[PDB]
C-alpha cells in the first residue's frame, strides 16, 4: 500500500509516491481551451497546444477558484500522469496557511466522493518544508507562484498568530517582467507569451545585493546584459530587467503594492513571536518554493534581515538546493511514517462526519 | 488575512494536542521511554525508529540520524522527571533520515506531554548539553541505507 503525495501549487502540480526522493510528475496547473471561441486540455498537453489555446489556472493565490477545472487537474494527475487508480491509494494533499476553511472542505469532499480515495490528509505546505530541512524550529519563507507565506514553527508547532501571508509571488513577478520587457520594445501580452516570459525569468533573473548600484551598472555598460533566443529564432537582449523583476519581492511598490517586502514580512513575523524564541527563528530562516530560486536571494535576505535585527543576533538563511520540491519531499517523508498516517481521514470517517472532519484531524 | 474562519483556526488548540498525543501512542519505540534518569538512544533506519543497544550509546554513524532522550531530575523536584530530547544529524545523513528524526522528535515530545525541550544537534555543531551526555563522543564511518527510492 503506497500513499500518493500531491502538492497542488498555484502554478505547478508536484505529484508522486510517498517514499520517493522526488515527485515523479511535475506539470503546469493549467487547463487550456481554444483561443478562438476534446474541448479542453490539461497540464503538459495544454502546454503542447499553447499555440491555439488560452491557458487558465484553477488556483489563484493558493485558493481553488475553478472547481470544475481543478477536478480536471486531479483526474489528469491520477489517471494520465501517475497512471494510478486513486481508490487504491491514501492521498496526502497540501495547502498554504490562512486559506478559507471551505477550500479544504471541498478538497476533502472531492477526494472522497469523486475520486473515492481510501484515506487522505491535508498538510500545511511550510511545515512540510521545515521537516524536509531536518528541523523542528525555524521560520519558513514559502514563495511559489501564487502566495508568499512566512510561517514560524517552534518544536514542531506552527505559531498561528505570527503566520503572515502576501499575495505577491511568482505569477506577479512574471507579469511584471512582461510589462517591463514590453517597455523595452519586446511585446509580451498573451497567455502564451507569458509562458515565454516565465522562462526568461527563471533562466536570467537574479536578486541584486545593492539594487541602486546595480541599476547604475546596467546603465553604464552592457556587462550585465544577457541574450535570449525566442522560439522563432530571434535573439533579444535583456538588461536591468534581470534584477528589477525580483526586486519587487523587496519593494512591492514596483507593482503598486504598499506592502512590506519579504525581508520585512519575515522580520515582522519573527517579532510576533515570544522574545526568547526569536533567536532560534533568526538563525533558521528556511527558504522554500520556486520564487526563492533567484540567484542572490539568500545573500540579500541575510543583508536585509541583519539591518532590521538586533546587532548581536546570529542570522542565517537556509537555501536547500532542492527547494522547488521541499514541500513535496517533506510530504513524502511524513507519509512514509505509520504514526502520521494514523491521523488521516478514512472513508468510513468521512461517510460518518462529512467535510467538517478535516478541521478536526488535519493540523 | 485573519485566522477565525481559516485553515489555521484550529492550530494551537487542545484538540490539536489531543490528536497528536493519540498518534504518538502508535510508535512502539516510546513504550517505557523516559521512566528513569539516564540516556536512551534510537536510530532512524528506513523511516523506522530503532533502539540503539546500551553498549553502543555514544557512538554515532556519520551517515545516520538519531534521537537521544536525556531524562533527569529537575531542580524543582528531586523525585520527578524532566527531559531534553536531542536529535543528532550526521554529516552524511540523507534527507529522509534527518526529516524523520525531526518529526519523531516532535512525536516523542508529544508522547511525554510536551515536557521535553528539543535540541537539533548537527555533527560538528553539537551543543554543550549534548557533549555533556557522554562524559566522549565517538563518530563512526558509514551508516544504514536511505529509505528513499531514488527517482532517476
Ligand atoms: N530559477 C527560478 N528563478 C525564479 N523563479 C523561478 C525559478 N524556478 C521557478 N520559478 C518560479 O517559481 C514558481 C513555481 O514555484 P512553485 O514553488 O512550484 O509554485 P507553486 O507551489 O506552484 N505555487 P503556490 O500555490 O504559491 O505554492 C513560478 O512562478 C516559477 O516561474
Ligand atoms: Ca544513513
Ligand atoms: Ca516540548
Ligand atoms: Mg507551493
Author numbering:
A (entry chain A): 5 to 41, 50 to 375
B (entry chain B): 7 to 141, 144 to 160
From the paper:
Upon polymerization, actin undergoes a conformational change from the monomeric G-form to the fibrous F-form, which is associated with the flipping of the side chain of His161 toward ATP.
We found that His161 in A108G was not flipped as in G-actin, despite the overall actin structure adopting the F-form. This indicated that His161 flips to avoid steric hindrance caused by the methyl group of Ala108 approaching upon the flattening of the actin molecules. The non-flipped His161 affects the positions of W1 and W2. W1 forms hydrogen bonds with both Gln137 and non-flipped His161 but not with W2. As a result, while maintaining a near in-line position (167°), W1 is located far from both PG (4.0 Å) and W2 (3.6 Å). Thus, the configuration of the two key water molecules in the active site suggests that the ATP hydrolysis activity of A108G is low even when the overall conformation adopts the F-form. In contrast, in the F-form A108G, non-flipped His161 has no steric clash, while a replacement by the original Ala at 108 causes a steric clash between non-flipped His161 and an additional methyl group. For instance, Nε2 (His161)–Cβ (Ala108) is 2.3 Å. Replacement by flipped His161 in the F-form induced no steric clash. On the other hand, in the case of Nε2-protonated His161 (ε-tautomer), the ring formed stable hydrogen bonds with the surrounding water molecules, and the shift of the ring was small (∼ 0.5 Å). This suggested that non-flipped His161 in A108G would adopt ε-tautomer.
